[PDB]
């Protein structure tokens, strides 16, 4: 069970939604709430930070990738 331990933090320029949500947050505010707000989504709560607002995507994303019905799985 590996993949890799070195380190980066840069642009993934590579795919598109999937099932990693590995590395740090990879999604800024805005490229967190350019998502939430095409789903409609509140780009910030009644008590949210970037972290969480940016999770919370980070984790629609997952469920919600493109209009596709699914459960997704319990962590990689």
Same mark, same amino acid.
């Given at each position: 069970?590996?993949? @890799?331990?070195? @380190?980066?933090?840069?642009?993934?320029?590579? !795919? *598109?939604? #999937?099932? !990693? !949500?590995? *590395?740090?947050?990879? #999604?800024s505010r805005?490229?967190?709430?350019?998502?939430?707000?095409?789903? @409609?989504?509140?780009?910030? *709560?009644?008590?949210?930070?970037?972290?969480?607002?940016?999770?919370? #995507?980070? %984790?629609?994303?997952? #469920?919600?990738? !493109?209009?596709? %019905?699914?459960?997704?799985?319990?962590?990689?």
């Amino acid at each position: 069970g590996s993949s @890799g331990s070195s @380190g980066t933090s840069s642009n993934p320029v590579l !795919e *598109l939604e #999937l099932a !990693e !949500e590995k *590395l740090p947050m990879t #999604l800024s505010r805005q490229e967190v709430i350019r998502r939430l707000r095409e789903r @409609g989504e509140p780009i910030r *709560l009644f008590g949210e930070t970037d972290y969480d607002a940016f999770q919370r #995507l980070r %984790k629609i994303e997952i #469920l919600t990738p !493109e209009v596709n %019905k699914g459960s997704g799985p319990s962590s990689g």
